[PDB]
Paper text:
Class A plexins (PlxnAs) act as semaphorin receptors and control diverse aspects of nervous system development and plasticity, ranging from axon guidance and neuron migration to synaptic organization. Plexins are large type 1 transmembrane proteins comprising typically ten domains in their extracellular segment, a single membrane spanning region that is predicted to be helical and a conserved, cytoplasmic region that contains a GTPase-activating protein (GAP) domain with a Rho GTPase-binding domain insert. All our PlxnA ectodomain structures show autoinhibitory, intermolecular “head-to-stalk” (domain 1 to domain 4-5) interactions, which are confirmed by biophysical assays, live cell fluorescence microscopy, and cell-based and neuronal growth cone collapse assays. This work reveals a 2-fold role of the PlxnA ectodomains: imposing a pre-signaling autoinhibitory separation for the cytoplasmic domains via intermolecular head-to-stalk interactions and supporting dimerization-based PlxnA activation upon ligand binding.
We determined crystal structures of the full extracellular segments of mouse [name], PlxnA2, and PlxnA4 from eight crystal forms providing a total of 13 independent structures that range in maximum resolution from 4 to 10 Å. In five out of 13 full extracellular structures all ten domains are resolved whereas in the other eight structures some of the C-terminal domains were not modeled due to fragmentary or absent electron density. The ring is closed only in the 4 Å structure of PlxnA11-10, by interactions between the sema domain and domain IPT5 (domain 9). In all other structures, the plexin extracellular domains associate only via the consecutive domain-domain interactions. The membrane proximal domain IPT6 (domain 10) is positioned perpendicular to the ring formed by domains 1 to 9, and the IPT6 C terminus points away from the plane of the ring. This out-of-the-ring orientation of IPT6 is observed in all five PlxnA ectodomain structures for which the electron density is sufficiently well ordered to allow IPT6 to be resolved. All our PlxnA full ectodomain crystal structures have an intermolecular plexin–plexin interface in common. This interface is formed by blades 1–3 of the sema domain of one plexin molecule and the outer side of domains 4-5 (PSI2-IPT2) from the ring of a second plexin. Superposition of the crystal structure for a full-length PlxnA extracellular segment onto our previously reported Sema6Aecto–PlxnA21-4 complex (Janssen et al., 2010) brings the two IPT6 domains into close proximity. The distances between the two PlxnA ectodomain C-termini in these modeled complexes range from 10 Å to 59 Å for the five PlxnA crystal structures that have all ten domains resolved.
Numbering used by the authors: 37 to 265, 271 to 1153, 1164 to 1210, 1216 to 1227
The structure:
């Protein structure tokens, strides 16, 4: 669907209203007033606009000449009011001291526009919507039509009244128009701004936002100025009221109004809307039918009425409660208590006069205690609060009891709120949000429901938009329909659509319309699963929450088929489709097809209720396991080797598989070891192996070796054992010793028996991976592969000659010492004398158990204890060295004795392990910031010793980087308190100290001033920076974030207070700085871990754009644009014009360069060059 819309072709719009009979929509705008159809087609356009005029002029140029210069100005529609009684439209403008227009209702024919007298002028004010009011009428001949109207004044106190009661004559040409209801030389039916109050508070003014007639009164929601809150302007939002039948204007009342949400103040009205609550909200808010209610919108605080805050709150007032606050306040002043308290009106405070009276809601004011104010600000019940997108407008309405609220947003969005405080729920909940002018055109206060209350016309600055109160048809499913909750929506069961009660035919009948999710259609089928091979199966259907279907029903499995059904009890009986029909579906989807079986109602002819219905196909299973041990009833035929639903389709009786444990499958034995190039048989076990039948061949073993696949015929001995015949196997590579290979056991050529455990054959070669005795006896005892002394290589007994009865050696259980251990290399080459070092020895022909190498390892004399977990048998020993303090030697060779220190079974390291004692004497900054992050350079001797290193400053750990013989470099942690700190370095079990070498933590540096407060796009200019403790950071640098890019540049520290910095380049091909200048997203300095200096909140640093230069005894003159920027202070570019290498003395001007020449020319300024 699309939202019906009227676009504002040229100008902004201001007001909208709907005619209660026709549904015609009238639209006030700047310079225009439109009549529109219900669907927002243009019907008629009135020009009201651009008028030659001037605001300063009293009576406008028409009546008297004005000395002030006139110009073509825009006429803003300030107000718009439907006068149904006199078949017309009051269309009050501005820009003529506020003269009012009368347009005829059905064609916009100007009936009248009075502007001779002073009353025909309303206000100079050129602001839209700061005005409001109501039209009230009696029958012709009686007390005639009146207009109550508030407007701002702009300080023109003596020209215009802010609030007035004015006359509406039947003749638009009649001069009496907009004259006051009762005028006297003492009191007139108007209320003026006192001159004394404008002298005191310069630009006090009353802005009227909303207005409505209620019972017998007239209310206004207003904004005023600081008068007990010269200074600055802060506003107070108030309610005003009058009796309709009070020509004297004595009934005037004025209470401050707002509401609070968790200690946050909302005191600025943006809009309101008087309404009903309907049965729902009325009851639990405690009201009678015709009792009224006022929805409102407030912004946070009391700041900036011209441009309010995003923070906004929708509150609520019951009029009975405001009526009680006013009655309570009047029955209080008629007790003589306190003053009237109305700052702007009465400057000197007159007192409350006591008197005996029957104070009623019918009270219309009296002569003494006069116009009066309000002390107790009236608090409202909060409903919904937007924090990211400010509310702008509101409306509400009664729907079948439930109270729907409409809320415009600054974004151009409308919210559809059920108010549920009086309703069961925890608090009033948003139901739905909708889009009007998505780009961010705000919605305006004038937001009216249609007469039929089917739509809601939503006005923006630039477009009117017909938003339906209901569009439930976007909801596809009963479950989503009633899930949205926006109360207009119900599921019209038999039409399978989502819409309102009045739109669902026959909804009034039983179960035909669903309103709570529990009413949703629930369906079940008895035979949920039906086989492809079956046909016309009887199915029973149970359905609940469904109307009387005695109209008739069909079953449609999808848009493929449709079978007739008959009704009995609370059940529906229909048949499955034919095999001829079923397969057209299942073809392609294989294993199974889940299909949504619907019910098609005869009355509607639309599918409404559904179920998961399964069409299973046994035949497509191509193995016993899939067939039986699947999820379905399927039978496997051992002999035909096919899966099917029918027992009889099997070969014969004794070949039917119904149980998964009875399947043809290969069972595992202890691993199948196969040496390459050796004639071997491979016996297998299995279960229920078939006797090959008529015209059927015997068994084979197929080996899936990528290099060569071997086909070897086999013999089936019984239902439980196989054997491939004497053969040898190979693969071409010599790359991997142990290759596991997929084998498939076949019979009758292509029938592959099932392999559940996926049993493999391991093809092993005698080592192409092991040229060391220790490596062979290390590998599987299964391979049978062993080490053969004489050859100096390793192969089976098979492949090695027995010249001695013990010439071929195999690790019996691992009780096999391996001759000639050798050490290749060992890590840490150095270590501390104290020990604790983890020595990492890597050899080739070591022992095969740990408990033999344990006790074997020694470093010269020093006993070394080996580690279990970190020991990799006969390749690697990890060993922990003991205390070597007592050793005389400085360095010693490493020794391993395999089990016994026998003369052939000992290894000695090729180069020797060195003992030292590392020392340190200097640190290369000795100072650094408390936050830390300083690159420290500890100098000493033997610093690269051992395994682990840990540096601790104040007990807190340093982040390590790299190690050297002479240097340790690490990054400092944050210090607890500033000053001297101990440096503790521990290498393994050695903990070395020096109290003469300390580290001094320094108070965090500060940045005060950058001097020039600017630079160009490519940067590179000098910046004279000032602050504190700047010598405590060795390498500080400037940081700047422009757009999505972050960039850095260098600094040179001079004093503890002074620093020269080279400005960061922000060169971005996406954004260029404007001629005016631009602040970066972030600007700061990188100083170790002091992170508060990375981002500068107070900084006003600006970036200007990068010079334009024109090419080809008298002096040189070089012309061009952008030579000098509009920069603060003196600060300008240090230009240098050079010739081959010689610089000149030049005076720089804004368009020209005055170099001096004696007769290849290069101009330089920072990092800029041009020829
Ligand atoms: C439920 O699902 C089943 C199974 O998924 C399915 O039945 C299939 O129906 C379609 C028809 O649309 C068949 O597909 C066509 O096959 C045409 C030729 O079929 C020959 O080859 C068959 C395949 O042999 C394979 O499977 C066996 C066992 O697993 C395996 O050992 C082999 O190595 C091999 O991989 C073979 O089964 C078939 O023999 C059947 O028919 C005879 C006579 O009725 C019967 O006695 C046998 O018992 C057996 O059922 C036959 O020899 C072929 O023309 C065609 O291929 C063309 O089109 C495609 C697509 O456009 C191209 O890609 C291709 O290049 C060709 O141009 C097509 O593939 C399929 O064979 C059936 N499946 C089986 C197992 O028979 C049904 O949809 C469902 N059942 C019902 C009742 O609805
Ligand atoms: C640690 O060292 C740092 C830096 O190394 C040092 O900071 C400077 O200290 C020197 C003195 O040692 C000061 O220089 C003196 O300035 C006297 C006149 O000041 C005027 O001129 C200043 C320099 O102009 C240069 O820089 C500008 C801007 O970069 C540039 O446009 C020019 O082309 C020119 O190269 C100028 O900055 C200064 O403006 C300051 O004051 C204003 C207003 O109060 C303020 O708003 C600014 O923020 C700015 O600070 C002003 O216009 C000058 O008389 C004096 O010359 C005497 O001394 C020399 C050498 O000893 C003698 O030969 C000679 O006979 C004179 O007696 C000298 O040139 C300079 O002011 C300091 N800089 C700053 C930024 O304050 C710190 O003092 C040292 N810190 C500590 C703690 O010891
Ligand atoms: C395929 O569709 C079928 C629709 O028929 C689904 O079958 C139903 O499956 C559920 C469980 O998945 C069963 O519910 C259970 O009922 C148990 C009691 O079972 C007895 O009572 C059954 C009805 O009164 C009766 O059918 C059943 O007899 C069965 O077993 C006999 C012996 O093996 C056999 O000879 C008969 O032919 C028959 O199959 C028992 O006497 C109860 O203990 C459980 O707690 C559970 O509630 C339904 O009973 C099944 N319906 C039928 C008609 O058998 C099936 O789920 C679908 N398959 C898949 C994979 O989804
Ligand atoms: C570890 O580092 C800190 C910080 O860098 C070292 O303290 C600094 O020592 C240097 C020496 O180079 C001082 O500079 C000298 O200051 C002498 C006079 O000091 C007074 O005047 C200072 C500047 O006007 C003033 O800050 C300081 O007051 C400080 O101490 C007060 C009492 O403890 C304290 O309440 C204040 O807040 C303030 O921190 C002195 O009154 C002067 O004779 C020299 O001419 C030279 O300028 C710095 O002032 C010291 N800076 C700081 C921040 O304390 C400390 O010595 C280092 N530790 C070791 C063991 O070396
Ligand atoms: C101005 O606004 C009016 C309404 O404010 C509007 O005119 C209406 O149009 C609707 C359809 O948008 C019409 O309603 C129809 O009523 C007849 C019965 O007389 C039905 O047959 C119609 O049903 C059809 O449409 C259904 C929904 O699309 C289909 O499901 C169905 O199959 C039918 O095809 C439909 O309910 C109606 O005629 C008028 N309203 C009135 C009161 O006459 C119009 O959009 C706007 N016109 C202009 C000129 O701007
Ligand atoms: C509920 O179910 C009933 C029964 O299951 C079902 O009745 C079906 O009605 C249609 C008519 O709408 C029958 O189809 C006809 O059969 C003749 C042969 O006897 C065909 O020649 C016709 O097919 C032509 O028209 C089709 C549609 O335009 C074309 O697709 C086709 O090319 C032909 O030109 C004719 O339609 C059908 O036989 C029965 N079904 C069965 C199983 O007999 C009905 O749809 C449902 N009832 C209601 C009230 O909706
Ligand atoms: C099905 O047939 C299989 C294979 O033909 C039979 O497995 C065989 O079981 C016999 C025991 O009778 C094993 O014989 C043994 O051999 C060793 C020789 O090293 C000998 O020392 C023992 O005295 C014993 O005779 C034989 O290894 C094994 N066959 C193969 C090929 O490994 C099985 O008995 C039959 N199963 C049923 C249920 O009938
Ligand atoms: C040797 O056999 C193994 C195991 O049988 C093969 O590896 C894997 O084979 C399985 C089949 O069981 C594949 O699994 C598949 O996974 C998908 C997941 O989407 C599933 O939909 C299928 O039903 C199936 O189970 C798996 O892809 C495959 N592994 C790899 C990495 O491809 C292996 O292919 C055989 N070796 C050689 C050399 O052929
Ligand atoms: C077969 O079913 C068994 C028992 O339910 C289960 O343990 C196993 O996962 C299934 N195996 C296969 C291969 O489907
Ligand atoms: C081949 O297998 C047969 C039967 O298992 C056996 O008698 C013979 O020893 C095997 N021959 C060789 C060379 O391995």
């Amino acid at each position: 669907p699309a939202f019906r819309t009227f676009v504002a072709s040229d100008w902004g719009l201001t007001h909208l209203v709907v005619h209660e009979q026709t549904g015609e929509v009238y639209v006030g705008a700047v310079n225009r007033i439109y009549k529109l159809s219900g669907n927002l087609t243009l019907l008629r356009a009135h020009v009201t606009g651009p008028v030659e005029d001037n605001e300063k002029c009293y009576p406008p140029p028409s009546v008297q000449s004005c000395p002030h210069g006139l110009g073509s100005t825009d006429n803003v529609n300030k107000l718009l009011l439907l006068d149904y009684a006199a078949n017309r439209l009051l269309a009050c403008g501005s820009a003529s001291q506020g003269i009012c227009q009368f347009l005829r209702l059905d064609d916009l024919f100007k009936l009248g526009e009075p502007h001779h007298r002073k009353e025909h002028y309303l206000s100079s004010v050129r602001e839209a919507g700061s005005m409001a009011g109501v039209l009230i009428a009696g029958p012709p001949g009686q007390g005639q039509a009146k207009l109550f109207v508030g407007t701002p004044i702009d300080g023109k106190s003596e020209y215009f009244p802010t609030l007035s009661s004015r006359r509406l004559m039947a003749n638009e040409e009649d001069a009496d128009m907009f004259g006051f209801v009762y005028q006297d030389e003492f009191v007139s039916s108007q209320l003026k701004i006192p001159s004394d109050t404008l002298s005191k508070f310069p630009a006090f003014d009353i802005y009227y936002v909303y207005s409505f007639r209620s019972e017998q009164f007239v209310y206004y929601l207003t904004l005023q100025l600081d008068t007990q809150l010269a200074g600055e302007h802060f506003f107070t939002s108030k309610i005003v009221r009058l009796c309709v039948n009070d020509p004297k204007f004595y009934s005037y009342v004025e209470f401050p109004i707002g509401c609070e949400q968790a200690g946050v103040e909302y005191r600025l009205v943006q809009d309101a809307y008087l309404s009903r609550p309907g049965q729902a909200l009325a009851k639990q808010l405690g009201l009678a039918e015709d009792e009224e209610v006022l929805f409102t919108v407030f912004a946070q605080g009391q700041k900036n009425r011209v441009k309010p805050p995003k923070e906004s709150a929708l509150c609520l007032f019951t009029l009975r409660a405001i009526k009680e606050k006013i009655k309570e306040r009047i029955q209080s002043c008629y007790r003589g208590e306190g003053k009237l308290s109305l700052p702007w009106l009465l400057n000197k405070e007159l007192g409350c006069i006591n008197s005996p009276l029957q104070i009623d809601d019918d009270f219309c004011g009296q002569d003494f205690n006069q116009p009066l104010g309000g002390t107790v600000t009236i608090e409202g019940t909060p409903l919904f609060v937007d924090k990211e997108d400010g509310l702008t407008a509101v409306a509400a309405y009664d729907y079948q009891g439930r109270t729907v609220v409409f809320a415009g947003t600054r974004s151009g969005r409308i919210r559809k709120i059920l108010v549920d405080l009086a309703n069961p729920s925890g608090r009033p909940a948003l139901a739905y949000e909708s889009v009007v002018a998505q780009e961010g055109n705000p919605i305006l206060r004038d937001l009216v429901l249609s007469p039929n209350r089917q739509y809601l016309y939503a006005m923006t600055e630039k477009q009117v938009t017909q938003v339906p109160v209901e569009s439930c048809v976007q909801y596809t499913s009963c479950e989503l329909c009633l899930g949205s909750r926006d109360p207009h929506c119900g599921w019209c069961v038999l039409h399978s659509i989502c819409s309102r009660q009045d739109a669902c035919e026959r909804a009034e009948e039983p179960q035909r319309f669903a309103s709570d999710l529990l009413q949703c259609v629930q369906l079940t089928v008895q035979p949920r699963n039906v086989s492809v091979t079956m046909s016309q199966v009887p199915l029973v259907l149970q359905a609940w929450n469904v109307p009387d279907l005695s109209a008739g029903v069909n079953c449609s499995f999808e848009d493929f088929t449709e079978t007739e059904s008959i009704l009995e009890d609370g059940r529906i009986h229909c048949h499955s489709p034919s095999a001829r029909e079923v397969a057209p579906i299942t073809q392609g989807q294989g294993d199974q097809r889940v299909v949504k079986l619907y019910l098609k109602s005869k009355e509607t002819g639309k599918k409404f209720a559904s179920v998961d219905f399964v069409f299973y196909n046994c035949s497509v299973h191509q193995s016993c396991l899939a067939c039986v041990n699947g999820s379905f009833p399927c039978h496997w035929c051992k002999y035909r080797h096919v899966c099917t639903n029918n027992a009889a389709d099997c070969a014969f009786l004794e070949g039917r598989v119904n149980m998964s444990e009875d399947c043809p499958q290969i069972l595992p034995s202890t691993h199948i070891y196969v040496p390459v190039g050796v004639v071997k048989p491979i016996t297998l076990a299995a279960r229920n192996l078939p006797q090959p039948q008529s015209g059927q061949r015997g068994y084979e073993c197929l080996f899936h070796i990528p290099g060569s696949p071997a086909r070897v015929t086999a013999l089936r001995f019984n239902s439980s054992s196989l054997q491939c015949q004497n053969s040898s196997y190979s693969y071409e590579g010599n790359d991997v010793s142990d290759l596991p290979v997929n084998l498939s056991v076949v019979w009758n050529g292509n029938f592959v028996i099932d392999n559940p455990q996926n049993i493999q054959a391991h093809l092993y070669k005698c080592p192409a991976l092991r040229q060391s005795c220790g490596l062979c006896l290390k590998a599987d005892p299964r391979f049978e592969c062993g080490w053969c002394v004489a050859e100096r290589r390793c192969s089976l007994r098979h492949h090695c000659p027995a010249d001695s009865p013990a010439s071929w050696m195999h690790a019996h259980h691992g009780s096999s010492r391996c001759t000639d251990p050798k050490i290749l290399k060992l890590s840490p080459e150095t270590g501390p004398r104290q020990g604790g070092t983890r020595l990492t020895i890597t050899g080739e022909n070591l022992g095969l158990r740990f408990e033999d190498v344990r006790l074997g390892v020694h470093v010269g004399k020093v006993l070394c204890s080996p580690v279990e977990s970190e020991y990799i048998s006969a390749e690697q020993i990890v060993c922990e060295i003991g205390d070597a303090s007592t050793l005389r030697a400085h360095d010693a060779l490493v020794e391993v004795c395999v089990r016994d220190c026998s003369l052939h079974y000992r290894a000695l390291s090729p180069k020797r392990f060195t003992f030292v004692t590392p020392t340190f004497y200097r640190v290369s900054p000795s100072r650094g910031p408390l936050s830390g992050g300083t690159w420290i350079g500890i100098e000493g001797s033997h610093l690269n010793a051992g395994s682990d290193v840990a540096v601790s400053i104040g007990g807190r750990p340093c982040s390590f980087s790299w190690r050297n013989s002479r240097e340790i470099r690490c990054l400092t942690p944050p210090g607890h308190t500033p000053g001297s700190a101990p440096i503790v370095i521990n290498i393994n079990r050695a903990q070395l100290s020096n109290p003469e070498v300390k580290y001094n933590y320094t108070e965090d540096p500060t940045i005060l001033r950058i001097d020039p407060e600017w630079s160009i796009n490519s940067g590179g200019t000098l910046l004279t920076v000032t602050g504190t403790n700047l010598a405590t950071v060795r390498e500080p640098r400037i940081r700047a974030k422009y757009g999505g890019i972050e960039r850095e540049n260098s600094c040179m520290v001079y004093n503890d207070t002074t620093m020269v910095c080279r400005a960061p380049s922000i060169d971005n091909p996406k954004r260029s700085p404007p001629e005016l200048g631009e602040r970066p997203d972030e600007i700061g300095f990188i100083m170790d871990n002091v992170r508060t200096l990375l981002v500068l909140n107070s900084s006003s640093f600006l970036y200007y754009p990068d010079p334009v230069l024109e090419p080809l005894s008298s002096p040189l003159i070089l012309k061009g644009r952008n030579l000098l920027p509009p920069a603060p202070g003196n600060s300008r570019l240090n230009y240098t014009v050079l010739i081959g290498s010689t610089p000149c003395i030049l005076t720089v001007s804004e368009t020209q360069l005055l170099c001096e020449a004696p007769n290849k020319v290069t101009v330089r300024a920072g990092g800029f060059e041009f020829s």
